[PDB]
Amino acid sequence: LPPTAFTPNGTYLQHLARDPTSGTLYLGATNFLFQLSPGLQLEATVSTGPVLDSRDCLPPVMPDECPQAQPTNNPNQLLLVSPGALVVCGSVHQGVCEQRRLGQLEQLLLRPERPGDTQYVAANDPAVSTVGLVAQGLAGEPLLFVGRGYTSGGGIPPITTRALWPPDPQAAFSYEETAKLAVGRLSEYSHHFVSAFARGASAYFLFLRRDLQAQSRAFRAYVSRVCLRDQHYYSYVELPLACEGGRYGLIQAAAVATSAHGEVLFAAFSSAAPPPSAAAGASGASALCAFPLDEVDRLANRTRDACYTREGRAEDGTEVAYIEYDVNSDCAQLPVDTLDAYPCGSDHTPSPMASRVPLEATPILEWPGIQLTAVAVTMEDGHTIAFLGDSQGQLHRVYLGPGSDGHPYSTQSIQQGSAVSRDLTFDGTFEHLYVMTQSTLLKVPVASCAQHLDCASCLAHRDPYCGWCVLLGRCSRRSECSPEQWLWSFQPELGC
Numbered sequence: 001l002p003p004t005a006f007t008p009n010g011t012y013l014q015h016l017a018r019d020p021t022s023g024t025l026y027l028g029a030t031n032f033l034f035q036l037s038p039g040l041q042l043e044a045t046v047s048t049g050p051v052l053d054s055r056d057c058l059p060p061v062m063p064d065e066c067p068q069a070q071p072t073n074n075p076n077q078l079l080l081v082s083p084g085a086l087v088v089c090g091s092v093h094q095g096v097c098e099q100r101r102l103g104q105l106e107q108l109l110l111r112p113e114r115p116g117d118t119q120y121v122a123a124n125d126p127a128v129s130t131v132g133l134v135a136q137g138l139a140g141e142p143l144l145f146v147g148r149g150y151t152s153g154g155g156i157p158p159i160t161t162r163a164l165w166p167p168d169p170q171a172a173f174s175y176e177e178t179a180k181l182a183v184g185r186l187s188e189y190s191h192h193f194v195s196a197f198a199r200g201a202s203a204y205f206l207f208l209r210r211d212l213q214a215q216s217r218a219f220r221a222y223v224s225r226v227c228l229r230d231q232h233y234y235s236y237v238e239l240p241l242a243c244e245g246g247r248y249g250l251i252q253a254a255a256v257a258t259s260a261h262g263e264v265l266f267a268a269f270s271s272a273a274p275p276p277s278a279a280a281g282a283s284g285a286s287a288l289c290a291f292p293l294d295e296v297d298r299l300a301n302r303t304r305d306a307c308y309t310r311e312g313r314a315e316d317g318t319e320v321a322y323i324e325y326d327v328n329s330d331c332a333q334l335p336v337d338t339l340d341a342y343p344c345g346s347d348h349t350p351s352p353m354a355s356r357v358p359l360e361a362t363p364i365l366e367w368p369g370i371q372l373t374a375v376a377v378t379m380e381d382g383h384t385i386a387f388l389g390d391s392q393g394q395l396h397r398v399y400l401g402p403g404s405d406g407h408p409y410s411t412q413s414i415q416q417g418s419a420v421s422r423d424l425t426f427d428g429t430f431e432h433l434y435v436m437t438q439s440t441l442l443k444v445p446v447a448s449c450a451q452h453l454d455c456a457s458c459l460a461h462r463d464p465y466c467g468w469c470v471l472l473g474r475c476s477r478r479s480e481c482s483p484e485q486w487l488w489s490f491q492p493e494l495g496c
């Protein structure tokens with residue numbers, strides 16, 4: 001009865017967003033927006049282009065003012081579900097956004113009639129990623145954190161906090177001039193955003209940028225952190241990521257443990273090719289690293305502490321923190337009380353801070369001929385399981401528990417030769433995983449224990465999800481065994 005696949009014709013897919021509330025999926029495609037049921041049933045379709053456009057011109061694109069306007073396709077740049085609306089940002093018209101009714105994709109709520117430079121949100125070029133994070137203000141108001149990667153005018157701050165629904169709704173998607181990360185030489189740093197996410201009272205960003213502190217000026221992986229309430233980016237701090245000592249320098253994808261939202265960040269990294277492309281085919285390798293978010297916070301906190309009170313030196317020895325992006329600021333010898341008084345900083349504290357000391361992780365998975373593009377991690381019966389996507393449109397399933405090499409328990413083709421989107425998202429019950437490539441979307445079950453009819457078959461075909469439920473006479477997940485005697489396939493040791 002329900003579709004098992006979604007293959008839209010005459011388009012390529014960019015983004016996927018799941019509505020936690022209703023289960024509804026939204027799809028960002030070239031000149032199209034789709035609304036699907038949790039069962040992949042097509043519910044609504046909206047056209048987004050082509051449009052008369054030019055990156056040199058400002059919206060509304062007027063032919064008399066922009067004679068070089070030519071029909072342009074509109075790949076989806078950003079697609080996020082907020083309590084009130086569906087947030088939609090395209091590659092076209094300077095990365096302007098809109099708000100659509102959730103469940104009624106056709107219904108437009110807000111699309112500013114005559115927008116200004118302060119409302120150009122997303123990267124106005126496909127080929128360049130944009131990241132987003134829907135959060136709340138102190139009053140519960142909806143905020144959108146944006147990671148706009150550098151586009152060759154696009155002199156827009158790399159990270160911003162824009163209001164989704166302010167007093168004047170015509171002023172939506174604008175940041176308060178203060179709520180941004182001012183970087184003076186964006187062309188030189190060349191940001192490449194991967195993911196944006198939250199934990200506690202903080203928004204975090206995963207990205208590549210050139211490490212201009214190094215004579216090499218080579219691209220490096222970084223984790224970034226700002227307080228959710230901080231409207232001046234005072235609390236902003238950067239940490240270099242290492243996996244393992246930069247052998248796999250380029251971060252590709254990351255996800256946190258979900259079954260709800262863990263405390264560990266799982267990040268797929270690929271080794272670099274001679275813009276920051278990962279070495280392709282058998283010449284390049286990938287690795288999966290785990291960075292517990294407390295370790296992230298410990299280091300950011302000690303980067304802040306050093307920079308605030310002990311001139312970024314930090315006893316005993318020394319030179320652990322500094323001011324990044326060439327900003328005319330320096331680390332300080334401020335009172336100790338500053339740490340407690342100003343956790344998210346102030347007008348007097350040094351900003352933007354960054355660590356000299358990187359956050360180091362050793363891989364748990366090291367795949368020599370594979371180029372990882374997507375990460376999704378879940379937890380079944382306390383055991384950590386990872387669903388990883390690659391450049392060839394494969395989906396590998398990896399048990400990541402005690403004493404296991406990064407080897408996959410299964411590998412399947414989603415779409416030969418088409419990279420799996422970073423947008424790997426489970427369903428409400430964690431029974432399925434939505435797996436998207438550039439031309440298809442599949443509702444992939446997390447297990448098929450059911451397929452094995454006897455105990456012999458159930459244990460012979462090792463899946464961490466599966467075991468033999470004795471009292472039920474069925475091959476199942478532990479949760480389905482009712483807690484009774486359940487013969488786990490990864491730990492058989494008799495007696496059937």
Ligand SMILES: *[C@@H]1O[C@H](CO)[C@@H](O[C@@H]2O[C@H](CO)[C@@H](O[C@@H]3O[C@H](CO)[C@@H](O)[C@H](O)[C@@H]3O)[C@H](O)[C@H]2NC(C)=O)[C@H](O)[C@H]1NC(C)=O
Nearest residue numbers: 201293294295296297298299300301302339340342343344
């Ligand atoms: C990084 O530094 C920040 C402070 O700048 C640390 O935040 C403080 O962490 C403590 C530890 O839990 C928080 O205390 C607890 O708050 C909970 C919330 O209700 C309460 O139930 C506990 O009984 C306890 O009071 C404190 O509120 C928090 N303050 C702020 C401003 O966040 C953070 O924990 C440090 N992280 C690491 C990894 O070191």
